[PDB]
Ligand binder design. Structure first.
Ligand code: CDL
Ligand code: U10
Ligand code: PC1
Ligand code: PC1
Ligand code: PC1
Ligand code: PC1
Ligand code: 3PE
Ligand code: 3PE
Ligand code: 3PE
Ligand code: 3PE
Ligand code: PLC
Ligand code: SF4
Lengths: 175, 155, 70, 318, 70, 98, 115, 83
């Protein structure tokens, strides 16, 4: 049912994580993180944040494109490993999906599960707000306050990105 | 009737293949200069649907334009092999036909037909740009008379 | 001559014209001859879901004027 | 009636792409003192139909050294994402009316890059690999400039909605107030579409065929279809951004005719350019956009943040 | 006798520097390249309609061999 | 604590366990750090968007800004490791003994 | 619903075209046909060998600048605030620091590809 | 004034893109501090009614608060209709 779209996207979100957490060739690990970024954008986008969902997808699409170039230069071998070529990779991949299956199986059967925290399986739609906003997007108004309210945040992040460029040149200088 | 249908389908695929011939960008010797003039404005092979493409995996025709030497022969067979079918070979010039001026050389293959199958032989040294274009239009007529589906229909 | 290039542009132009025309006409057909209601913000969506209830036929594009008040 | 709307979008798109190949070959032909296709059909009108059939009845091969799942996923991803970048385009009414349509197209254009990287890598060929890593360099070159060029224009429109760009240009095209930004935007769509003089991922005379050297038959056609659907789309985007068309709600067809003509002319300029200029070295493309466009784009971004404030011309949020 | 092909010193007066600045920023010499290919688009192509038309030859042309009679 | 929070919190645990169990490639571990940041971004965005905490809506963006700095910093170190040994294997990083 | 159905149709059409490509044509597969392409001669080594990136430093810098678009894209909404003096100050400060980063790398030969 | 003019001409001859960049950016920082219209941008943003204007309970001692929307009291947008 489409009422569980958020839950169905979060299952793919975990499956993508098991994709790169099992650590095959970073080429295939990068693909797994793109799938998680794509569905993660979908999950966030269904809670009312379209800018946040599209932005994280946009940032991670460029992030894994640099990682792809770095994988062909410094993280490549003759036979890049897939989720089936190695027992250690395959073992961790099957284990991740089985735990995902059991958690999904129990939450949809009992409507509850207790692991550190107590989770509810009624559906994500039961916690949404029943009132409408006005003529604006609340997420957009909060993000636009960074420049009027977040003067201190803009300075530290701005300085951090500046020093970030200085640092990477220093680290990679080699002399 | 089933024979009528396969006849019309055969006319359709035969038409599509002869109207969209893509020669491989492959020339060896002087004969490739005359092949350039067939792409030049006067003859404009592109207007017949004949477009060069460099990758053997996107080519339908190989034009062996020039001399084939023993050193190059393995390379020719490789690029011919890497052509998805259906694939046709056109042999252009005396060298590619039977060795030409260099028939009796220690280092020349006496005809490209010793290495690959050949569909059309274009004579000359070099054939004029208009003589190569005759061979291409003669190849198209050869494709127009194929009976792939009709032969399948009565197997 | 160069004007022999025009027939290929006319066919291409007709193909680019259809998507815009089809969407414009399909929207009219699906909203009772009006533009499809644009709801970019919750206030507009709130009014569209109120139109469904007022229409009495579960359609937001069925308008009810002063004939429905008395 | 929504499924009919989808089909009335993708099918005409695939037909326009088919005849853009004819139009490019004839326009390149006449700029080269020749004719181009005129035999297969009257004036070559059946040439695209002959090419489509030829490619899809030809043998496709999976190279012995290829990674099959990624080798076949790449062409599917390319065409699936080239058709997905048309759904928010107002012509004048979008199929999918998005509040952040400009962001959506940016996100999809960054995801469509991987149809090149995975295509080239999965082929397990040296020329496909060299082609794939040229797409990494190309994306690093234009991505920052492209996004900030859009931002500068949107500071005069006031929203990320594509349909709002129609209202912004109701009195005047944005080419006038933003001609410096329109120049850089146009060059960045050439780089983003891998078009000459920035056709480096393929680079015929250098890499034979680049990232798709190992592709044959139908799978190759999907990459070609995706390539040509993108250039039309990136020029429809340009016409909406800088050459706004008047929208009369009672004559929505007049918008489409006028908007279609501008898109055709911008698309013709892509073919006009491919016939006129040599090819950049892909390290010279990086320096073009980081040392020339980025310094200017950053300056113009500051200028367009301040200009609305100091003139009292900040656009409405909605 | 010889000539230099690329031994020239550009002018440094403010009007010449500005002219080169306009060329760099406004792509004047690239726009000029566009104008040359636009001219060809409106010229008659040099293509002949083979096989209905044939490229000119001469009586000295060396084609297929033949044995003659008296 | 809806059923979505379970999967998001499980994603973080998977990426954490993935980061703490190296195979060979330093690049494979860098992906797990970027995976963990993605989970935290999603989990924070969900909580903030659901509670209508308007001003907090910028926090997830500030979380991505400093995730890139770390990711860039990790890549810069990976360049120097590769330049010294020709690979990004972590078993070569053993000259220093505890 | 509409967006999801539009995506399913685009990738279903893309998939069906690929399926037809592999099942309609006549195939004749043999070893030499599917060997890797290297202009006619056998490749000398594996395509999976390391491929040096000469623009690695510029690629790292792309990660940092690509995060400025996330911080800069909210500007159209930021201009709607009543605190324009503060908003315009921090908008220009943020863009300027982005420019100083470019100037530093440019002057320190950071944008030049390694030999 | 002679040596400085040499610097400007030299950069204008070798980095015309950068000369335009710094000139454009300089105007972005300077003009807002000088334009008389900058104050109206603040007023227009403050005059846009996103929220509902919640009424004030009338205790009988609020002479500057209107009782009806069309009363003379309260802020006026006459300036905006002419700006
Ligand atoms: C976004 C969607 C991403 C899709 C998954 C990633 C692509 C698959 C992949 O990378 O596997 C590589 C990896 C390498 O296998 P390989 O391709 O056989 O190696 C190539 C050799 O040369 C082997 O060469 P070969 O000679 O064996 O190849 C012959 C084969 C070759 O035929 C094929 O390659 C199959 C065609 C694949 C089509 C891929 C396109 C998918 C449809 C389009 C979707 C577009 C997006 C919408 O032809 C056949 O005989 C077919 C039958 C044999 C099965 C072939 C293997 C199928 C694996 C499953 C693929 C899916 O495959 C695996 O190890 C399977 C593990 C499971 C992978 C999926 C999980 C990854 C985690 C991230 C995803 C998270 C979940 C999201 C998906 C679920 C949504 C509900
Ligand atoms: C002199 O010394 C020597 C050399 O030195 C030069 C040499 O070199 C050589 C070696 C020689 C050779 C290798 C051969 C040389 C021969 C030549 C002809 C080269 C000379 C110069 C040229 C300029 C020739 C042609 C090259 C170019 C660049 C011309 C440009 C025009 C073109 C038409 C090329 C392609 C252009 C376009 C616009 C695309 C057309 C491409 C297609 C594949 C067709 C369309 C594509 C499709 C996929 C089909 C469309 C429809 C689809 C996909 C379906 C859509 C619809 C649906 C319903 C689905 C030798 C021996 C030599 O001695
Ligand atoms: C009219 C109603 C109708 O048609 O059914 C839709 C029906 C009914 O219309 P509706 O419910 O979408 O809209 C309501 C219509 N009025 C306003 C009259 C009430 O919608 C559906 O139930 C879903 C349709 C599923 C898909 C329908 C088939 C699509 C495939 C058609 C193949 C032909 C496409 C040709 C494309 C040509 C391309 C060049
Ligand atoms: C490959 C096959 C997948 C194609 C890529 C899809 C990427 C995710 C698409 C995100 C859509 C979006 O941004 O919303 C637009 C817009 C957001 O822009 P918006 O601001 O206009 O929001 C519209 C809503 N109103 C009207 C209130 C403003 O959202 C929508 O159009 C409707 C939301 C539907 C959400 C359904 C998402 C489920 C699909 C997610 C698939 C994730 C897997 C991706 C894997 C990619 C890696 C291979
Ligand atoms: C040099 C290479 C790069 C070239 C790039 C530019 C090429 C494309 C330039 C398009 C210029 C406009 C094409 C004119 C033909 C289209 C006619 C048309 O749109 O309607 C008349 C249009 C008027 O229709 P309108 O809808 O554009 O309205 C004008 C603009 N507003 C909305 C602000 C009023 O006028 C012209 O275009 C006359 C030229
Ligand atoms: C098809 C319908 C026919 C009309 C189509 C339009 C054709 C336009 C292209 C041909 C132009 C003619 C060639 C020409 O005169 O150029 C030489 C001329 C001169 O070339 P020049 O390099 O010798 O410069 C001479 C003067 N100095 C050296 C001092 C600079 O080039 C130009 O002047 C063009 C300037 C236009 C700049 C436009 C760029 C900005 C675009 C903004 C968006 C629009
Ligand atoms: C519950 C959580 C544990 C689930 C089981 C996970 C183990 C799955 C099997 C596995 O990972 O492989 C067994 C591993 C040896 O694997 P291998 O990489 O082949 O070692 C020799 C390589 N030269 O040997 C092991 O280390 C398994 C340890 C358990
Ligand atoms: C000769 C040189 C060629 C150069 C290349 C030109 C490029 C191609 C031109 C763009 C493509 C235009 C093709 C279509 C033009 C005619 C369309 C038209 O005006 O039709 C009338 C229009 C609505 O008609 P329509 O919706 O398209 O069809 C009925 C669907 N139920 O309703 C209207 O009356 C709208 C007003 C139309 C005014 C004209
Ligand atoms: C007159 C046209 C007005 C309309 C133009 C509008 C476009 C403005 C952008 C283009 C720049 C032109 C404006 C600059 C002044 C030009 C007039 C001028 O400089 O005076 C002429 C005089 C004659 O030059 P001359 O003596 O032969 O040799 C130079 C020796 N210094 O030269 C001199 O000797 C005076 C000293 C010259 C050096 C001054 C510094 C010039 C370079 C600074 C950058 C100018 C561009 C800045 C704007 C960039 C954005 C476009
Ligand atoms: C109030 C807030 C606004 C102010 C913000 C404060 C920060 C301003 C700077 C932000 C932009 C960062 C870049 C600034 C440094 C400029 C770039 C640089 O470092 O140049 C160094 C340059 C190196 O080049 P080199 O190899 O030595 O060869 C040429 C030698 N002449 O060596 C050189 O020769 C350079 C010579 C000096 C260049 C001076 C550049 C000044 C730039 C600011 C001018 C702005 C005003 C101009 C516009 C006026 C208004 C129209
Ligand atoms: C590699 C895979 C990892 C494991 C994934 C889980 C597989 C086993 C699921 C069994 C649970 C069950 O019986 O529930 C089945 C549900 C069906 O959906 P629902 O919305 O809950 O409908 C049921 C509730 N009704 C009746 C109210 C509508 O399935 C799921 O939603 C699983 C997530 C989608 C699968 C991933 C894509
Ligand atoms: S056949 Fe004649 S023109 Fe052709 S390669 Fe041989 S010698 Fe040269």
């Amino acid at each position: 049912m489409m009422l569980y779209i958020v839950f169905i996207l979060s299952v793919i979100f975990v499956m993508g994580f098991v994709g790169f957490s099992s650590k095959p060739s970073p080429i295939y690990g990068g693909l797994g993180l793109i799938v998680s970024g794509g569905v993660g954008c979908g999950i966030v986008l269904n809670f009312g944040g379209s800018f946040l969902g599209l932005m994280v997808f946009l940032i991670y699409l460029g992030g894994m494109m640099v990682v792809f170039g770095y994988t062909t230069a410094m993280a490549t071998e003759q036979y890049p490993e897939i989720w089936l070529s190695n027992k250690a990779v395959l073992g961790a991949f099957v284990t991740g999906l089985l735990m995902e299956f059991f958690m999904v199986y129990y939450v949809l059967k009992d409507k509850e599960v207790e692991v550190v925290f107590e989770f509810n399986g009624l559906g994500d739609w039961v916690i949404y707000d029943t009132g409408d906003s006005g003529f604006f997007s609340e997420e957009a108004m909060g993000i636009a306050a960074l420049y009027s309210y977040g003067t201190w945040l803009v300075i530290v992040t701005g300085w951090s990105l500046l020093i970030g460029v200085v640092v990477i040149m220093e680290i990679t200088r080699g002399n | 009737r089933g024979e009528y249908v396969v006849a019309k389908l055969d006319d359709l695929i035969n038409w599509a293949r002869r109207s969209s011939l893509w020669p491989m960008t492959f020339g060896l010797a002087c004969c490739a200069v005359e092949m350039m003039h067939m792409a030049a404005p006067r003859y404009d092979m592109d207007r017949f649907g004949v477009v060069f493409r460099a990758s053997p995996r996107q080519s339908d025709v190989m034009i062996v334009a020039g001399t084939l030497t023993n050193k190059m022969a393995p390379a020719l067979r490789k690029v011919y092999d890497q052509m998805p079918e259906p694939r046709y070979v056109v042999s252009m010039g005396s060298c590619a036909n039977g060795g030409g001026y260099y028939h009796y050389s220690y280092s020349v293959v006496r005809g490209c037909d010793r290495i690959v199958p050949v569909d059309i032989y274009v004579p000359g040294c070099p054939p004029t740009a208009e003589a190569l274009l005759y061979g291409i239009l003669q190849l198209q007529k050869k494709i127009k008379r194929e009976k792939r589906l009709r032969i399948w229909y009565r197997r | 001559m160069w004007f022999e290039v025009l027939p290929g542009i006319a066919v291409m132009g007709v193909c680019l014209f259809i998507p815009g025309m089809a969407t414009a006409r399909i929207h009219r057909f699906s909203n009772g001859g009006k533009e499809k209601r644009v709801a970019h913000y919750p206030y507009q969506w709130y009014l569209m879901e109120r139109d469904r209830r007022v229409s009495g036929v579960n359609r937001s594009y069925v308008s009810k004027g002063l004939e429905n008040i008395d | 009636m929504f499924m009919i709307n989808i089909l009335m979008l993708i099918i005409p798109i695939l037909l326009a792409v088919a005849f853009l190949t004819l139009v490019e070959r004839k326009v390149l032909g006449y700029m080269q003192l020749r004719k181009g296709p005129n035999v297969v059909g009257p004036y070559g009108l059946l040439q695209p139909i002959a090419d489509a059939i030829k490619l899809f009845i030809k043998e496709p091969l999976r190279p012995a050294t290829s990674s099959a799942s990624m080798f076949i996923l790449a062409p599917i991803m390319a065409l699936g994402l080239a058709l997905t970048m048309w759904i928010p385009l107002p012509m004048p009414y979008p199929l999918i009316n998005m509040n952040l349509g400009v962001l959506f197209m940016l996100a999809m254009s960054s995801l469509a890059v991987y149809s090149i990287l995975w295509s080239g890598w999965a082929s397990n060929s040296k020329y496909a690999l060299i082609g794939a890593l040229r797409a990494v360099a190309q994306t690093i070159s234009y991505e920052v400039t492209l996004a900030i060029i859009l931002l500068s224009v949107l500071l005069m429109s006031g929203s990320f909605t594509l349909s709002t760009l129609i209202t912004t240009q109701e009195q005047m095209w944005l080419i006038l107030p933003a001609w410096p930004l329109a120049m850089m935007w146009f060059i960045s769509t050439l780089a983003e579409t891998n078009r000459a003089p920035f056709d480096l991922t393929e680079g015929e005379s250098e890499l034979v065929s680049g990232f798709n050297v190992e592709y044959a038959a139908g799978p190759f056609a999907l990459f070609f279809m995706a390539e040509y659907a993108n250039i039309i789309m990136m020029n429809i985007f340009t016409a909406i951004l800088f050459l706004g068309t008047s929208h009369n709600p009672h004559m929505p067809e007049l918008y489409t005719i006028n908007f279609t003509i501008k898109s055709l002319l911008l698309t013709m300029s892509f073919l006009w350019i491919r016939a006129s200029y040599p090819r950049f070295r892909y390290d010279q493309l990086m320096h073009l956009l980081w040392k020339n466009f980025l310094p200017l784009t950053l300056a113009l971004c500051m200028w367009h943040v301040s200009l609305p404030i100091l003139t009292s011309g900040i656009p409405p949020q909605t | 006798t010889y000539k230099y092909v690329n031994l020239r010193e550009p002018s440094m007066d403010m009007k010449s520097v500005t002219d080169r600045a306009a060329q760099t920023l406004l792509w004047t010499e690239l726009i000029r390249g566009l104008g040359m290919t636009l001219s060809y688009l409106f010229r008659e192509p040099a293509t002949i309609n083979y096989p209905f038309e044939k490229g000119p030859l001469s009586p000295r042309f060396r084609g297929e061999h033949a044995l003659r009679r008296y | 604590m809806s059923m979505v929070y379970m999967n998001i919190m499980m994603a973080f645990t998977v990426s954490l366990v993935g980061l703490l169990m190296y195979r060979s490639h330093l690049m494979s571990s860098l992906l797990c750090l970027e995976g963990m940041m993605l989970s935290l971004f999603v989990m924070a965005a969900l909580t903030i968007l659901n509670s209508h905490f308007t001003l907090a809506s910028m926090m997830p963006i500030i979380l991505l800004v400093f995730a890139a700095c770390e990711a860039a910093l990790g890549l810069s170190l990976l360049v120097m490791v590769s330049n010294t040994y020709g690979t990004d294997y972590v078993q070569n990083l053993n000259l220093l003994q505890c | 619903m509409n967006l999801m159905l539009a995506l399913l149709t685009n990738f279903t059409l893309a998939t069906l075209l690929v399926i037809i490509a592999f099942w309609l044509p006549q195939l004749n597969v043999y070893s030499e046909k599917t060997s890797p392409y290297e202009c006619g001669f056998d490749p000398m080594g594996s395509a999976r060998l390391p491929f040096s990136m000469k623009f690695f430093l510029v690629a790292i810098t792309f990660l940092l600048f690509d995060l400025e678009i996330a911080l800069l894209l909210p500007l159209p909404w930021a201009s709607q605030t009543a605190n324009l003096n503060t908003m315009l100050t921090m908008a220009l400060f943020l863009i300027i620091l982005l420019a100083v980063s470019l100037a530093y790398e440019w002057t320190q030969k950071g944008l030049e590809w390694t030999e | 004034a002679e040596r400085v003019a040499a610097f400007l001409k030299n950069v204008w001859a070798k980095e015309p893109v950068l000369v335009a960049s710094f000139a454009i950016a300089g105007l972005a920082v300077i003009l807002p501090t000088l334009s008389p219209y900058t104050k109206y941008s603040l007023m227009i943003n403050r005059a846009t009614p996103y929220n509902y204007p919640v009424p004030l309970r009338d205790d009988g001692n609020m002479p500057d608060v209107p009782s009806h929307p069309q009363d003379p009291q309260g802020p006026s947008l006459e300036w905006l209709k002419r700006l």
